[PDB]
């Protein structure tokens, strides 16, 4: 009785999901990747599965054939279909659910192509509009029903923010808040200054030698995940020169007067596999490979009070790649309970 | 009638002040460096004056003798006195004011040693307590009198924050606010993880491969510069891997309801050599070599409103090295009007 | 009286050539850029001309129209023709010579399209086969004749290597040699690990956090520039995490017994605007903005001798972007003597 | 039955040796660390043992007392004696051998102080002159006898170079050769440009934004390890912006005519735990955590031939921290056979 996963797009997230699923399969969870769909040569995909500059070397023998990646002598078929309804992984490989990572299928309407191939459910690894559910595991996975065939995982930043916001909202109420995520550079940024698809003047700039402000949607979209905070949050990002590892700061007005210790005790109550409480004075390197969606840092909590007014700053780390990945894998497991 | 400057400590800031003063001397301002005091070999100091990895090569011939740096054939004496009262630069070189950059003289009581050597006034390049004035040029230099012999320039971060806070306070009122400065790594951080003087667990970590949270004093000390905001601000920093170039975010509750455009127009009114208005979608690299203390970025201004509550985010860039340096040089010029 | 230049492809090199030509135009040189051809929106191109993370801010007012870049109120037409024979810059703008920077026209046969548009000569900013001349200014520009309509500048690395090799060959003879260039990352490298066009396993890897070995052609192609060394050199590169600034090491067997001092004096004899002699203990940052093709470093010269055998290591810095650019601009000036 | 180790100096290498020894202890090896001597607060040392920005988080519970580090509930005494003869770890903790990592004891005469404390043998983690043996495990450990009480491990670079040189010398003969190691920055380099202890103009420069040439001793000292190559090698380094991971290139004249394939097969014959053969197109990140002293890369081997002359370039990766550490640990194990 294994949940069988097809990965559409073997990019950074897809590969890490492959690694994560194999690790959980070793710890007896009933889940496996059975097939991949990607237009890149399998040899190149195998090599990128094996060697990662951020996440280390995969501790398994990895090779390839003409049409597969091989891991510890087991074949994983790599199809090369630009159109999802033509991937035969349901009948050939037993795919139940698809992790949709390509960027080309980021809406309810587009990803229905997988359902035409006999796929039961699709989890899109990106925000995908508001005519489907956006799920942050540990916050709102219980809103999923048998009828939810296409689901968004939101963004990496939504999965960092929502657990912290959820705890604050339940314990104190949030009236209004603004986020800044100090964030690792990502693969679509430019290595040196040059024209970028879309024409954005900041996306065009050398990523590993600049602090670069960037627009985000995770705070304005919080209402998709926690409806009672719809329209109460906003934010942005600063892209900085680390290759992975990010931190989300939230400054809030709460419905109640608090102390920093009180805030921190409240976060500790919501500790779970998706929401870690990390008091050991860590830096971004220490966060790489963490499996929680959001790693709350009580050492950075600050309450600033003047007269009757109070501002509350709460800070969560995340591995913008692996935290997000592991949140998605938990959501894929949750699909089997539907 | 030149203001003659002695520099105590030819560290990064001292050297950049030397460069800045020479540049202003070329543009006819009546100011010059006449002498330096530093325990390092002059040859090494000359080389670091000439070549800088962040600020480029100084466009002048630079060499040294046993006891001097030579710039374009002119000698600048390098004394090597661990005790300031023994530096003979007043009688030998005509020093009026001292730029105190060593870290060993960061109080009113310690820097009085310069006054024992016949120095008229001392500007300390760091926060130096509250029994002397902390001056951010363009904000409170007019509080200086003839009696102010020892003065603090505050920190680099205070000089980024105070012009923006000053404008907001005059136009709207600030009730409470919290800062985060996303900040370049500095010379006292560790290149690789290892023990650091003091034992701080975060200061110990590799600086160019981590986002590292850091305590700051610039927001809590704002009352020294703008007394009516005493106790109303707090903040911290995130040290990230750029060698220079920083940005200060302030989230405020204002005494009045506003729009982002209204906030930005208000900042534009206070534009000056110390406070630049920069709407051209810049990144940190573009800020290197800027001469303003604070470079307001209207593209990052955000007003988040929910019900009757409003949070206002305002963002200022700064060259944490050169912005600070140039603010200090303006303050040294102001000393001649006392 | 002015040599008028059209730039095809306004990429990093094209933009730097624009800057370099404007700087030389300010110093009296009879040369100007009159038009550009590029498919990118002019506004984006103008912004990247103005702001560069490596080379600083261009000290001119820069804006754009729908079809031009504007610099200090002067219009520079941006055409958007995918086929070079359709660019009307000869009749409209008086283009004499084209700097060909697109990558799409890197052969004698392809770049002839410019000649069909009435262009007198084309300099290709890349190695372009062996049925045309490859010119490294200061080494073999005097092989050009009136009949040379299409010319290669070689690569950035050829321009760093050839001056040094030339001096060694004339003074001592080279019998055999091998190069390693420790080289800045470039715009076609990946920011994070992922599939790359071509499938190269190393080109796929995160560029700013790895030392990455890379195949080069500059040593094996030296026979195009210095025919007597055809087949005597080979080499490779190590790509490292600096955004610009590179160094070329050559290990040689020379036809004569030498000392390090003798080698260094020999290089000093060939000093010129294209070949600088730099004894001041510089590092890569100091090399950024240098205008020579090759900056010889006598502090790194080593001769290792055992019995009758001798190995000679000679080292030249270069700004892999701007050194190359300025070499090309000197070659465009040389075209006017044909 | 266990070889008991005392570590003098719990710096980057000492801590990694602690990790390595604990890992080998888990795999049955009869070796353990029993005590440390270091002047730093144990709490700080414990934190740096646990969290490393390069080598990841140590997978053990780590805490401290006033005088110990605690790992998985087991106490490791931290003494704080500036003089080695006063450390009581022989009688208190059963120390057999000392790993000497402080820098203060880098000669035969100085480290004899440990022998006065009842220590059987000392391995110094650095080159330590020529009146003691310099041992590179897998090359010359069999020259050790019962009389060798104080031993040098050489440098990190000697351990990368010697295995490769050894194989070349045995199979082909080396007549002369020159090394360049493209090398990670180290803890004694400057984060930003400033004066450095010793006055070196290059050591003074910002390490994570420059290629910096650096003098080395590993090639000139090869005669200590392989006497027949005394005086036949020389070399230097280029420090580049990676925090760990290095590569050593050797260009040689061999006593015999060869092909690249022949060279690579010859290296494969000497493969061992100290000397790995790595054909999988790796980059420096993939080398982090490797346990071999030298990781030969056959993809970079080049033979350049012209007439009767031949240059042979061979390339070995190394984790300049952990490769060196693991070599030292193999040598400490070898001490038990004496």
Measure D297 CA to nearest chain A CA, in Å: 16
Chain Cα centroid distance, residue D166: 17
Give the Cβ contact number of residue C148 at 10 Å.
Answer: 15
**Residues of A with catalytic function:** 156
Catalytic annotation, pick one of D45, D132, D156, D312: D156
Return all residues near B268 (Cβ < 8 A) that are at least 6 apart: B277, B298
Q: Is D89:D101 a contact under the CB 8 Å cutoff?
A: no
Q: What's the token pair of residue B107?
A: 């109080």
Q: What's the CA gap between A209 and D191, in Å, rounded?
A: 15
Interface A–D counts its CB contacts (< 8 A) at: 31
Domain ranges of chain D: 1-154+321-338, 155-320
User: What six digits make up the tokens of C18?
Assistant: 């624009």
Binding-face residues of C in 146-185 toward D, CB within 8 A: 175-178, 180, 182
Total residues belonging to chain D:
338
Considering CB atoms only, which of B50, B51, B285 is closest to C53?
B285
C-alpha span between C233 and C222 (Å, rounded): 7
Beta bridge partners of D314: D250
Residues D33/D7, Cβ–Cβ less than 8 Å: yes
Pairing relationship of beta strands D62-64 and D68-71 according to DSSP bridges: antiparallel
Stated resolution in angstroms? 2.2
**At a CB cut-off of 8 Å and minimum separation 6, what does D328 contact?**
D13, D17, D99, D123, D125, D137, D153
Q: Confirm or reject contact between D81 and chain A (CB < 8 A).
A: no
The pairing of strands C121-124 and C97-100 is parallel
B63 at interface of D, judged by CB pairs closer than 8 A: no
Written as one string, the DSSP assignment of C27-74 is TT-SEEEEEEE-SS-HHHHHHHHH--TTT---SS-EEE-SSEEEETTE
Residues of B whose CB is below 8 A from D195: 40-41, 44-45, 48
**b/e map B98-110, b = 16+ CB within 10 Å:** bbbbbeebbebeb
Phi-psi region of D207 (alpha: psi -120 to 50; beta: other; left: phi over 0): alpha
**Position of tokens 């105190």?**
B100
Centroid of chain to Cα A238? 18
Whether the Cβ atoms of residue B120 and residue B96 lie closer than 8 Å to each other: yes
Give the CA angle between residues A103, A105, A110 to the nearest 5°.
160
Q: How far is CA D128 from the centre of its chain?
A: 13
Q: Exposed, middle or buried, C227 (CB in 10 Å: 0-12/13-18/19+)?
A: exposed
Q: Of B84, B150, B156, B212, which is the active-site residue?
A: B156
Alpha-carbon gap: C17 to the closest alpha carbon of chain A (Å) = 15
Closest residue in A to D59 (Cα) is A286
3-class SS of residue B234: strand
3-class SS string, chain A: CCEEEEEECCCHHHHHHHHHHHHHHHCCCCEEEEEEECCCCHHHHHHHHHCCCCCCCCCCCEEECCCEEEECCEEEEEECCCCHHHCCHHHHHCCCEEEECCCCCCCHHHHHHHHHCCCCEEEECCCCCCCCEECCCCCCHHHCCCCCCEEECCCHHHHHHHHHHHHHHHHCCEEEEEEEEEEECCCCCCCCCCCCCCCCCCCCCCHHHCCEEEECCCCCCHHHCCHHHCCCEEEEEEEECCCCCEEEEEEEEECCCCCHHHHHHHHHHCCECCEEECCCCCCHHHHCCCCCCEEECHHHCEEEEECCEEEEEEEEEECCCHHHHHHHHHHHHHHCCC
What span, in angstroms and rounded, lies between the C-alpha atoms of D146 and B57? 57
DSSP structure string for D48-86: HHH--TTT---SS-EEE-SSEEEETTEEEEEE--SSGGG
Using the beta-carbon criterion (under 8 Å), do A47 and D283 form an inter-chain contact? no
Terminal Cα distance for chain B, rounded: 15
- Window C:273-302, CB contacts with B under 8 Å: 280-283, 285-286, 288-289
Strands C97-100 and C74-79: unpaired
| Nearest-Cα residue of chain B relative to residue D205 | B53
For residue D13, the Cα-to-chain-centroid distance in whole angstroms is 8
The burial of D277, by beta-carbon neighbours within 10 Å (0-12 exposed, 13-18 middle, 19 or more buried), is given as middle
Q: Are D320 and D245 in contact (CB under 8 A)?
A: yes
Q: Report the residue from D51, D280, D288 with minimal CB separation from A282.
A: D51
**Nearest by Cα to A14 from A109, A91, A123:** A123
Residue B136's H or E segment, with its range, is none
Please tell me whether residue B155 adopts helix, strand or coil conformation.
Answer: coil
| Backbone phi, psi, residue C16, to 5° | -65, -35
Burial annotation A305-330 (CB, 10 A radius, 16+ → b, else e): bbeeebbbbbbbbbbbbbbbbbbbbb
| CB within 8 Å: B284 and A313 | no
Cα–Cα distance measured from residue C274 to residue C323, given in angstroms and rounded to the nearest whole number = 8
Handedness of CA D162, C258, D237, D281 (dihedral sign): negative
Q: Please name the member of C178, C232, C283 whose beta carbon is closest to the beta carbon of D212.
A: C283
Cα(B114)–Cα(B117) distance, rounded to whole angstroms?
5
Catalytic residue among C123, C132, C156, C287: C156
For residues B163 and B293, is the Cβ–Cβ distance under 8 A?
yes
H-run or E-run covering B111: helix B108-116
Instruction: Give the H or E element holding residue C20.
Output: helix C12-26
* Number of Cβ atoms within 10 Å of the Cβ of A198: 9
The reply to whether residue C311 touches residue D251, judged by beta carbons under 8 angstroms, is: yes
Is the separation of the CB atoms in D207 and D151 below 8 Å? no
Ramachandran class of D212: left when φ > 0, alpha when ψ lies in -120 to 50, beta otherwise: beta
Rounded Cα distance between D241 and D243, Å, is 6
Closest CA to C99 of C162, C21, C47, C189: C21
- Breaks in chain B (C to N > 2.5 A) come right after none
**C-alpha closest to that of B152 among B128, B118, B173, B172:** B128
Interface residue D305 vs chain C (CB under 8 A): yes
Would you tell me the crossing angle of helices A322-335 and A12-26 to the nearest 10 degrees? Answer: 60
CB spacing of B302 vs A232 below 8 angstroms? no
CB neighbourhood size of B83 (10 A): 11
If one counts every other C-beta atom within 10 angstroms of the C-beta of residue A151, the result is 27
Q: What are the structure tokens assigned to C293, written together?
A: 């093709």
Residue from C196, C283, C286 whose CB has the most chain D CBs within 10 Å, to mutate:
C283
Going by C-beta distance under 8 Å and a sequence separation of 6 or more, which residues neighbour residue A280? A286, D50, D51
- β-partners of residue B77 are B35, B68
Instruction: Round to whole Å and give the CA distance between B151 and B149.
Output: 7
Question: Which residue bears the tokens 């060259």?
Answer: B319
* B16 SS3 class: helix
CA distance D301 to D298: 5
Helix H or strand E segment including C209: none
Q: Which helix (H) or strand (E) holds B267?
A: helix B260-269
Query: In this complex, how many residue pairs, one in chain A and one in chain C, have their CB atoms less than 8 Å apart?
Result: 106
Residue C332 to residue D2: CA distance in whole angstroms: 74
Q: State the fold for domain D155-320.
A: Dihydrodipicolinate Reductase; domain 2 (3.30.360)
Chain B residues within 8 A of A181 when measuring between CB atoms: none
3-state DSSP assignment of residue D255: coil
Please state, in angstroms and rounded to a whole number, the distance separating the CA atoms of residues C311 and B185: 42
Question: What distance in Å separates the CA atoms of residue A162 and residue C134, rounded to the nearest whole number?
Answer: 59
Q: Does D241 touch chain A (CB under 8 A)?
A: no
Distance CA D213, CA D203 (A): 9
Within 8 A by CB and 6+ apart from B162, the residues are B136, B139, B154, B222, B225, B226, B293, B294
Strands (E) in B46-92, as ranges, are 62-64, 68-71, 74-79
Give B177's strand partners: B233, B252
- Secondary structure class of B194 (helix, strand, coil): coil
Q: Which of B41, B53, B204 sits opposite D209 (nearest CB)?
A: B53
Within 8 A of B285 by CB-CB distance, chain A residues are 205-206, 209-210
Which structure tokens are listed for D191?
Answer: 């984060």
User: What H or E segment, with its residue span, contains residue D100?
Assistant: strand D97-100
Structure tokens at A166: 């959820």
User: What are the start-end ranges of the E strands in chain C?
Assistant: 3-8, 31-37, 62-64, 68-71, 74-79, 97-100, 121-124, 133-134, 150-152, 174-184, 212-215, 233-240, 246-254, 275-277, 294-296, 302-306, 309-318
Q: Is C53 on the interface with B (CB under 8 A)?
A: yes
* Tokens found for residue D303: 């033979």
Do residue B281 and residue A201 have CB atoms under 8 angstroms apart?
A: yes
Bridge partners of residue C240, in order along the sequence: C184
Tell me, yes or no, if D47 comes closer than 8 A to chain A by beta carbon.
yes
The answer to whether residue C243 neighbours chain B at the CB level (below 8 Å) is: no
Q: Which residues contact B282 (CB under 8 A, 6 or more apart)?
A: B295, B297, B317, C51
Q: B195 and D45: CB-CB below 8 Å?
A: yes
In the DSSP assignment, the letter for residue B56 is -
Alpha carbon distance A64, A70 (integer Å): 5
Measured distance CA(D119)–CA(D97) in Å, rounded: 6
Cα distance between residue C273 and residue B283, in whole Å: 33
Whether C283 and D210 lie within 8 Å, measured CB to CB: yes
Which residue, C69, C153, C146, C49, is CA-closest to C111?
C153
Written as six digits, the tokens of D297 are: 């890369």
What gap in Å lies between CA B41 and CA B64, rounded to an integer?
Answer: 9
B163 near B327, Cβ under 8 Å?
A: no
Residue D163 buriedness (CB in 10 A; 0-12 / 13-18 / 19+): buried
Q: Does B243 touch chain C (CB under 8 A)?
A: no
Question: Token pair for residue C33?
Answer: 């850029």
Contacts of B94 (CB under 8 A, 6+ apart): B4, B34
Q: Which helix (H) or strand (E) holds D93?
A: helix D89-93
What value, to the nearest 5°, has the Cα angle with vertex C194 and ends C193 and C196?
Answer: 120
Closest Cα in chain A to C241: A208
The answer to whether A218 and A157 are in contact (CB under 8 A) is: yes
B252 Rama class: left (phi>0) / alpha (psi -120 to 50) / beta:
beta
Instruction: Give the pairing type, strands D302-306 and D309-318.
Output: antiparallel
Closest chain C C-alpha to A284 CA, distance in angstroms? 15
What is the C-alpha separation between D76 and D38, in angstroms, rounded? Answer: 12
In chain B, DSSP finds a helix count (H) and a strand count (E) of 7, 17
Q: How many CA atoms lie within 13 A of D97 on its CB side?
A: 27
Q: In A75-85, which positions are buried (b, 16+ CB within 10 angstroms) versus exposed (e)? A: ebbbbeeeebe
Give the residue among C293, C253, C279 at the shortest CA–CA distance from C172.
Answer: C253
Q: Going along chain B, which residue ranges are E strands?
A: 3-8, 31-37, 62-64, 68-71, 74-79, 97-100, 121-124, 133-134, 150-152, 174-184, 212-215, 233-240, 246-254, 275-277, 294-296, 302-306, 309-318
- D156 flagged as catalytic: yes
Q: Write the residue in A175, A247, A304 that is nearest to B176 by C-beta.
A: A304
What whole-number distance in Å separates Cα of residue A248 and Cα of residue A250? 7
């Amino acid at each position: 009785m294994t949940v069988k996963i097809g990965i559409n797009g073997f990019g950074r997230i897809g590969r890490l999901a492959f690694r994560r699923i194999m690790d959980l399969g070793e710890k007896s969870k009933d889940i496996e990747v059975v097939a991949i769909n990607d237009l890149t040569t399998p040899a190149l995909l195998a090599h990128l599965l094996k060697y990662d500059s951020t996440h280390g070397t995969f501790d398994h023998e990895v090779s390839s054939t003409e049409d597969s990646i091989v891991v510890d002598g087991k074949k994983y078929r790599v199809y090369a279909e630009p159109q999802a309804q033509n991937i035969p992984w349901v009948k050939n490989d037993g795919v139940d659910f698809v992790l949709e990572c390509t960027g080309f299928y980021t809406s309810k309407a587009k990803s229905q192509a997988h359902l035409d191939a006999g796929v039961k459910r699709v989890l899109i690894s990106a925000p995908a509009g508001n005519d489907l559910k956006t799920i942050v595991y540990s916050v709102n996975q219980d809103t999923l029903t048998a009828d939810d065939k296409i689901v968004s995982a939101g963004s990496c930043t939504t999965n960092s923010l929502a657990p912290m916001v959820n705890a604050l909202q339940k314990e104190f109420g949030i009236e209004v808040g603004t986020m800044t995520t100090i964030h690792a550079y990502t693969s679509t940024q430019m290595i040196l200054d040059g024209p970028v698809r879309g024409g954005n003047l900041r996306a065009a700039r050398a990523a590993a030698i600049n602090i670069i402000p960037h627009s985000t949607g995770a705070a304005k979209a919080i209402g998709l995940v926690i409806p009672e905070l719809n329209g109460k949050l906003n934010g942005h990002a600063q892209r900085v020169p680390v290759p992975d590892g990010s931190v989300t700061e939230l400054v809030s007005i709460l419905g109640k007067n608090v102390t920093a210790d009180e805030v921190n005790e409240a976060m500790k109550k919501y500790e779970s596999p998706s929401f870690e409480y990390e008091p050991n004075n860590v830096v971004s390197s220490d966060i790489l490979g963490r499996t929680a969606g959001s790693i709350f840092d009580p050492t950075q909590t600050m309450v600033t009070t003047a007269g009757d007014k109070q501002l509350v700053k709460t800070v969560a780390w995340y591995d913008n790649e692996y935290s997000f990945t592991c949140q998605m894998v938990r959501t894929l497991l949750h699909f089997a309970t539907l």
